[PDB]
């Protein structure tokens, strides 16, 4: 009862701190997912920029 509450709140605090660091692990997963997302979108930005920039170059020369 009393000792239930004491030891169970202890296990609560331990696994709550550890599972919020696991939430920080999930947040680093989301962080790197945003990193890959911005690398995807910005590399596609550079790709469309360079491709249609060279297309303007080619239409200019023609």
């Amino acid at each position: 009862s009393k000792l239930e509450a004491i030891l169970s709140q202890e296990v609560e605090a331990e696994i709550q701190a550890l599972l919020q660091e696991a939430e920080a692990k999930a947040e680093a997963v989301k962080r790197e997912a945003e990193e890959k997302a911005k690398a995807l979108l910005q590399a596609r930005e550079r790709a469309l920029e360079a491709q249609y920039r060279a297309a303007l170059r080619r239409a200019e020369s023609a």
Partner: protein, 50 residues
Amino acid sequence: LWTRAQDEVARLKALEELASGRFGFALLGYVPVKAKPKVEEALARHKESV
């Protein structure tokens, strides 16, 4: 040093004779009626009188 070592070794050998309950522990003893007050005073000195 040998007195403190015998005290700690007796504590280890007595804790070997305990009963653990997976982050819990059981204890069973036999003490006379003439020392029930000091036993209750020692048991009050637990974490919350566990």
